[model samples]
Target: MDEKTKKAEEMALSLTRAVAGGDEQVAMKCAIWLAEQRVPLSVQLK
Candidate 1:
């Protein structure tokens, strides 16, 4: 919906593509970026 949302999708897509293409650094960066994201409290199991 928003830029941040779109960016994360693109990052994941890029990471998948990078891995499929046998690249390392691109996937690593995106993997790290996604790993750094927070899990929202609203989505957590009580």
Candidate 2:
């Protein structure tokens, strides 16, 4: 994948892990950041 897509995938994975670990706030922040950056919806959904 390209650098930007790779980065977004990484961030989304990290955010998912954080949410799974019970850090909803951080997860939400990450979601917002990704949205602002126009990351794909699948990234956030995953």
TM-score per model over all chains: 0.73, 0.62
lDDT of the candidates, in the order given = 0.72, 0.80
* Collision pairs in model 1: none
The deviation in Å at residue 7 for candidate 1 is: 0.7
Q: In model 1, which regions exceed 4 Å deviation? A: 38-46
- Candidate 2 per-residue lDDT, tens place, 4-39, comes to 788788778879898889988878887887888897
Model 2 scores a TM of: 0.62
Q: State which candidate has the highest TM-score.
A: 1
Candidate 1: tens digits of C-alpha lDDT, residues 1-46: 9887787887877877887888899989987887787412122222
Best by lDDT: 2
Candidate 1: 10-residue stretch with minimal lDDT: 37-46
* Model 2: residue 17 alpha-carbon error in angstroms: 0.3
Q: Report backbone clashes per prediction.
A: 0, 0
